[PDB]
Write a protein that binds this DNA or RNA. Structure first.
Ligand SMILES: [K+]
Ligand SMILES: [K+]
Ligand SMILES: [K+]
Ligand SMILES: [K+]
Ligand SMILES: [K+]
Ligand SMILES: [K+]
Ligand SMILES: [K+]
Ligand SMILES: [K+]
Ligand SMILES: [K+]
Ligand SMILES: [K+]
Ligand SMILES: [K+]
Ligand SMILES: [K+]
Ligand SMILES: [K+]
Ligand SMILES: [Mg+2]
Ligand SMILES: [Mg+2]
Length: 1304
RNA sequence: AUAACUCAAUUUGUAAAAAAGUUUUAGAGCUAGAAAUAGCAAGUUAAAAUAAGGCUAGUCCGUUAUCAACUUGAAAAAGUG
DNA sequence: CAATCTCATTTTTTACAAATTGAGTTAT
DNA sequence: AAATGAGATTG
């Protein structure tokens, strides 16, 4: 009888029901409720609208930040608990004054001065220590016994803000000249014939200067005569500067040697480069690393370490002193030269002067930006110098302090404890505890320290003690926890679901991969009559000789080093591999480098051991735990080898277990899978073959909720929301249809700036390019496609090997690498900037061989810098493979209309498995319902071909129309070409033919291209399509004025309110930040979020007399009030002032609750206090199509013939608005503007008319520009009128309703 | 369509950390002058909170997902035109 | 009242698993 | 990232 169309989207699911002849039925549905209507007629087309499903990310960031706060608090509490007994003797209330510091004097138990509890001592303190860093320095340097409260405050300050953990081990700050002299000296021992002269260069001043790395490099090698920044020494300095140099051209290497000191891979990149150039060069590179460390410290410390043990605190004190001197000076200067402007600068808090800087909301950047012109227009020079150094007037608590390692704060903490433990015994006894408070960190592989109540926690306990930083190693089981961390995410082997998958870098796994590949190699020589498999002997030979010697095995090496040497073939042809083997024994060679014993690796009796070792290296990344894991193998290798094995670390897991590979045996053979891969006789059988082979027993040994299911698919939670919604829609429609299932179901599914600036900064830096200095950019500017490409191509044409001009981009071209006709790709992977696309070569193909020849090296540079990806590069270069084959072309064309996306396949599988539940007499599935999946293009092209057009901004009907067209087209296709079921339906020379076929597949809808009016299916002679009437039905359907558009009603969740903390002020609006913090005193939160609104019919007290007055009103229940409201709603409402609440008239009203007022006017609930537009403007099709054609030959003369349609459209919009919108000022502005601009071209007026439909669009009001006239939105900020209106509760389809007239 | 492998890009989910920001309070303002109001001196730091909070009391949990109405369920979801 | 204008926490690092897409080798 | 609910001031 019927089929179902579905259009799945992130914010929408369109749906339609169609009959044999592609009509959409209309049915009468019962209405419920207290109203006049008992029924309504509904068309079976419609669409469901919903807010986007959100990722878990924000929730995650919040949760983890929460944990950070409570653990930081616990740190302080540990400290205070160590100080408690001895502080009670010094100061009874000290810690109490601290914890009540936030309270106003009125609420304080103790005196208002936190530290010493009296004004004179407090003032004295601040006068002696204007910043906490003064106290830090003096407490690190001094020998004097110190007041215990100041000791506490300094330790607490270092523990509360402890700096980061990104550097392992400890630092003992270093005092760059000596390390530079060092670099020069080892370099000079390595090159005896050309020395470099230390010369009396100042290495400290030049390398620690505030400039960029490249400029310090250039300055440094300026002082070096005849040395070039690209020479070896220059590259070593650059390396030490954190940069990424390339040492290949120093050493005559054909392979890029590039060392970035940050990347974890360094020691291995050094290991291989060193491996080529000799190991007499290791001294040099370690030297460069030392100089890197000291140069990195020189950013923060900025002070000679001879004066103090507290270089950080000392450099903060330095910031303070120069702030003071420069401020005295600046004030003087403004007095003299610009006294008028003194006020604004040092007083007005709103101006971003020094007053806005200290007392206001102006940042360092905004302050600098404000006074730049005030400095350079005076006579001041050095203050500007400090401003470009960003050193000018610096606070000590700053955005850039995130560089500070915790090791320096630890240095100061340890110094203080050593100083004052002499005077205070408990500091000696507890010194280590305290250091460990600062030092200890929960390992990421442990996770939350939980007892049973955390859904997020995997960690296991070695003992039941409460965990502390001091007992952590003893109480927490770290090996088990670290193991669960990975194993709870890792795949089991699907063939042996109870078996863990092997490490990707496991030796056995790599033998399996190499042999699996090798087994299908075939060879022919002159004599032999056919290509033959390798035998077991030949494979073992190739493995021992090539795979166990060379890290990668090329086809050339297979030919020369095996077939020539061993088998004496001067020529051979290899059929199973291309240019080199994909599989390799990498771990074999890694271990060979480390353990230096090949007999050990080749000996079967060590297999287990080696497996275990690699498992450890894979399963743990913590070097201490790795060591403890390898102790048992301590005896087997020299302590140095254990030192190197320690550092070897791998990541990743395979697809297969060890039992599957080498464990199971075939009953007849007794051979494992790998035994067969090694020797199978004549047949050389694949893993796939072994697994599916009925003569072998491997196969039989192997053969041994909707919402969760959807949540488990891989895909954006956004699209998943629409997937679940789509299933619920189908359920409801099947119910609507009498519990009869559809004949078909046709589903179609819809398809920064900081990341960009990052890509370009890194790629450019790699490339060594100046284009950033020469042409500075800002993140937002990179939203421009042409400019982003410009910076990714390094200012160069991508095809022509010439420079491009930044001012000239408007004259340049963005070209598609593989043409858009074949591949619809809008991304930067398929796009390129060139001055003219004509220089790509032929239009029909990949860029020409000429262009590949000329540009391939440059594209290689870009690839290495990662300014282009691999995919881009391989597509760009494909012409040297023959470019696009005709078969490739046909592939693209059919991929345009046939849906390959895995997520959509999952949708079809869900629907197919819910619809088809029965099996036939052979125990095979009965498909009563065919699930068809189409790509958007089909309905798009159809729409364009037959002039059923689409303008999204008129209303939401187009989602539902799209679903209808999906059902019509999708049913027509399979009706016409039933064989294409295999492509389009879920479940189980010639290239040119395929190309023409899938390119023309849709022509059976057309009369002439010449085809008959009536199309049929040749085999059954059934009528699929009749050009005379069927199209007419399509038009009638699109025209239908009543389409069910349902905005899903949803309880709002998430944040309680906006996060900002406003200053104290008298408003009942401010929300307390803590139970007892009265916002009138303390400030608080504004703008809570309504979870849902409740209808209340009750009485409220009135006036001094408290006369009870009956009310009906709408009360927003905030997310924060929700649980309290639901626990006991009556007590909650009574605490709000409502009395004699009528409990059964309470109506829950989530966001977007729908109401109908007079004249069919509708409203949706935005909140308790605001409304959204609830009506759709159904614009007759003739106007939709006219608008489409006008805003974009015969169609032009239609437009010019129908120009009066503009006035008619304005009259539709205005009629609609006067009945429904009820914004009079804005409507008059619209009419005024439209009547202004009618001298404009008809295209322009069409486009901007299309702008006008946001006035009439459903949902939240929004602003729109007509031409240059902006129309500000009109919000509906009263809900009063709803309380007497008719509320409409709707089904998911909107076909079932219950309507409540609210009078009560 | 599936499986293993190579290379790469993307997405989702989790954990452990850092720097700021804000908010109240504390950093004795000074002279005039009744009064506001002037004149000048000043400023860089800290404590504490950072979803209200919860019981399960953990160095845990608290912003994702899921939700018409009615009858039924504690929930999923079931039953209703 | 409504018309108008304004506001909205930000950023950084480390470690890890899984799909998925898409260019390739081999198989069911 | 906007966009959209609502805070703040003005007509
Ligand atoms: K008091
Ligand atoms: K030089
Ligand atoms: K401020
Ligand atoms: K500021
Ligand atoms: K601050
Ligand atoms: K290959
Ligand atoms: K590892
Ligand atoms: K040993
Ligand atoms: K939600
Ligand atoms: K939301
Ligand atoms: K990630
Ligand atoms: K609903
Ligand atoms: K908002
Ligand atoms: Mg808290
Ligand atoms: Mg602060």
């Amino acid at each position: 009888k019927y089929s179902i169309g579905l259009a799945i989207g992130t914010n929408s699911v369109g749906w339609a029901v169609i009959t044999d002849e592609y009509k959409v039925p209309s049915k009468k549905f019962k209405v419920l409720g207290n109203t006049d209507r008992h029924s309504i007629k509904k068309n079976l087309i419609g669409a469901l609208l919903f807010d986007s499903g959100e990722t878990a990310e924000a929730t995650r960031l919040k949760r983890t930040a929460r944990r950070r706060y409570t653990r930081r608090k616990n740190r302080i509490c540990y400290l205070q608990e160590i100080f408690s007994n001895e502080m009670a003797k010094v100061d009874d209330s000290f810690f109490h004054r601290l914890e009540e510091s936030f309270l106003v004097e009125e609420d304080k138990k103790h005196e208002r001065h936190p530290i010493f509890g009296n004004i004179v001592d407090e003032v004295a303190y601040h006068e002696k220590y204007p910043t906490i860093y003064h106290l830090r320095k003096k407490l690190v340097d001094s020998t004097d016994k110190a007041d215990l409260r100041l000791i506490y405050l300094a330790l607490a300050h270092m523990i509360k803000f402890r700096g980061h953990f990104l550097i392992e081990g400890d630092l003992n700050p270093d005092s760059v000249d000596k390390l530079f002299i060092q670099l020069v000296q080892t370099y000079n021992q390595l090159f005896e014939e050309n020395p470099i002269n230390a010369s009396g260069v100042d290495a400290k001043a030049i390398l620690s200067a505030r400039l960029s790395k490249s400029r310090r490099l250039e300055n440094l090698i300026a002082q070096l005569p005849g040395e070039k920044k690209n020479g070896l020494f220059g590259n070593l300095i650059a390396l030490s500067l954190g940069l990424t140099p390339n040492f290949k051209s120093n050493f005559d290497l054909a392979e890029d040697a590039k060392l970035q000191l940050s990347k974890d891979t360094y020691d291995d990149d050094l290991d291989n480069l060193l491996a080529q150039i000799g190991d007499q060069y290791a001294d040099l590179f370690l030297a460069a690393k030392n100089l890197s460390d000291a140069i990195l410290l020189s950013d923060i410390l900025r002070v000679n370490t001879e004066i103090t043990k507290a270089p950080l605190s000392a450099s903060m004190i330095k910031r303070y002193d120069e702030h003071h001197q420069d401020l005295t000076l600046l004030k003087a200067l403004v007095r003299q030269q610009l006294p008028e402007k003194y006020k604004e600068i040092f007083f007005d808090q709103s101006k971003n002067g020094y007053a806005g800087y200290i007392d206001g909301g102006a940042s360092q950047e905004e302050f600098y930006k404000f006074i730049k012109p005030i400095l350079e227009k005076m006579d001041t020079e050095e203050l500007l110098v400090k401003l470009n150094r960003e050193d000018l007037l610096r606070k000590q608590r700053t955005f850039d302090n995130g560089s500070i390692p915790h090791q320096i704060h630890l240095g100061e903490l340890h110094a203080i404890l050593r100083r004052q433990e002499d005077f205070y015994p408990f500091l000696k006894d507890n010194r280590e505890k305290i250091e460990k408070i600062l030092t200890f960190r929960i390992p990421y592989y442990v996770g939350p320290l939980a007892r049973g109540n955390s859904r997020f926690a995997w960690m296991t306990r070695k003992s039941e003690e409460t965990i502390t930083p001091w007992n952590f190693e003893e109480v927490v089981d770290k090996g088990a926890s670290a193991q669960s961390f990975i194993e709870r995410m890792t795949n089991f082997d699907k063939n042996l679901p109870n078996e863990k998958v092997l490490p990707k870098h496991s030796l056995l796994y790599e033998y399996f991969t190499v042999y699996n590949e090798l087994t299908k190699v075939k060879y022919v020589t002159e004599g032999m009559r056919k290509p033959a498999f390798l035998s077991g002997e030949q494979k073992k030979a190739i493995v021992d000789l090539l795979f166990k010697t060379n890290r990668k095995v090329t086809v050339k090496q297979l030919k020369e080093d095996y077939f020539k040497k061993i088998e004496c073939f001067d020529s051979v042809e290899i059929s199973g591999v291309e240019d080199r083997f994909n599989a390799s024994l990498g771990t074999y060679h890694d271990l060979l480098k480390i353990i230096k014993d090949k007999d050990f690796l080749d000996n079967e009796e060590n297999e287990d051991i080696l497996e275990d070792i690699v498992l450890t290296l894979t399963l743990f990344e913590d070097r201490e735990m790795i060591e403890e894991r390898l102790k048992t193998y301590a005896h087997l290798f020299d302590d140095k080898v254990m030192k190197q094995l320690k550092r070897r670390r791998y990541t990743g897991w395979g697809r297969l277990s060890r039992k599957l590979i080498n464990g199971i045996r075939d009953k007849q053979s007794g051979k494992t899978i790998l035994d067969f891969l090694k020797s199978d006789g004549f047949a050389n059988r694949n893993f796939m073959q072994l697994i599916h082979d009925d003569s072998l027993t491997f196969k039989e040994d192997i053969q041994k909720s909707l919402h969760e299911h959807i949540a488990n698919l891989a895909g954006s939670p956004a699209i998943k929301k629409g997937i679940l919604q789509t299933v619920k829609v189908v359920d409801e429609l099947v119910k609507v249809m009498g519990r009869h299932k559809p004949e078909n179901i046709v589903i179609e599914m819809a398809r920064n700036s900081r990341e960009r600036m990052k890509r370009i900064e890194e790629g450019i830096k790699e490339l060594g390019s100046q284009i950033l200095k020469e042409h500075p950019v800002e993140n937002t500017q990179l939203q421009n496609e042409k400019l982003y490409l410009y910076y990714l191509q390094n200012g160069r044409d991508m095809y022509v090997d010439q420079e491009l001009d930044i001012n000239r981009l408007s004259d340049y071209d963005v070209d598609a690498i593989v043409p858009q006709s074949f591949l619809k790709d809008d991304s930067i992977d398929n796009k390129v900037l060139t001055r003219s696309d004509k220089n790509r070569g032929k239009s029909d193909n990949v860029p020409s061989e000429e262009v590949v020849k000329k540009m391939k090296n440059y594209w290689r540079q870009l690839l290495n810098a990662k300014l282009i990806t691999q995919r881009k590069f391989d597509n760009l270069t494909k012409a040297e493979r023959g470019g696009l084959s005709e078969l490739d072309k046909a592939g693209f064309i059919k991929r345009q209309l046939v849906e390959t996306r895995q997520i959509t396949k999952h949708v079809a599988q869900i629907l197919d498995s819910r619809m088809n539940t029965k099996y036939d007499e052979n125990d095979k599935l009965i498909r009563e319902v065919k699930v068809i999946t189409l790509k958007s293009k089909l309905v798009s092209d159809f729409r364009k071909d037959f002039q059923f057009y689409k303008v999204r901004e008129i209303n939401n009907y187009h989602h539902a129309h799209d679903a209808y067209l999906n059902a019509v087209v999708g049913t027509a296709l399979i009706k016409k070409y039933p064989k294409l079921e295999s492509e389009f339906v879920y479940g189980d020379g010639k290239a040119t033919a395929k190309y023409f076929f899938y390119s023309n597949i849709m022509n059976f809808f057309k009369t002439e291209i010449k085809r008959p009016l009536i199309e049929t299916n040749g085999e059954t002679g059934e009528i699929v399509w009749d050009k005379g009437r069927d199209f007419a039905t399509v038009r009638k359907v699109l025209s239908m004025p009543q389409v069910n558009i349902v905005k899903k009603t949803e309880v709002q969740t998430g944040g309680f309110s906006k996060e900002s903390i406003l200053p104290k002020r008298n408003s009942d609006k401010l929300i307390a930040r803590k139970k007892d913090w009265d916002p009138k005193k303390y400030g608080g939160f504004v703008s809570p979020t309504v979870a849902y609104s409740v209808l209340v019919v009750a009485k409220v007290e009135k006036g001094k007399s408290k006369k009870l007055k009956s009310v009906k009103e709408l009360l927003g229940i905030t997310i924060m009030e929700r649980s309290s409201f639901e626990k006991n709603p009556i007590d909650f409402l009574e605490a709000k002032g409502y009395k004699e609440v009528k409990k059964d008239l309470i109506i829950k009203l989530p966001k977007y609750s729908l109401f109908e007022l007079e004249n069919g006017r509708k409203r949706m609930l935005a909140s308790a206090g605001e409304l959204q537009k609830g009506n759709e403007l159904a614009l007759p099709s003739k106007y939709v199509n006219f608008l489409y054609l006008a805003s974009h030959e015969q169609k032009q003369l239609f437009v010019e013939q129908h120009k009066h349609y503009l006035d008619e459209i304005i009259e539709q919009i205005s009629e609609f608005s006067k009945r429904v919108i009820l914004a009079d000022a804005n409507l008059d502005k619209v009419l005024s503007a439209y009547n202004k601009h009618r001298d404009k071209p008809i295209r322009e007026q069409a486009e901007n008319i299309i702008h006008l439909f946001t006035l009439t669009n459903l949902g939240a009001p929004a602003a729109f520009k007509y031409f240059d006239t902006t129309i500000d939105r009109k919000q509906y900020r009263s809900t009063k009128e709803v309380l007497d209106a008719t509320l409409i509760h709707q089904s998911i389809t909107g076909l079932y309703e219950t309507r409540i007239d609210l009078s009560q």
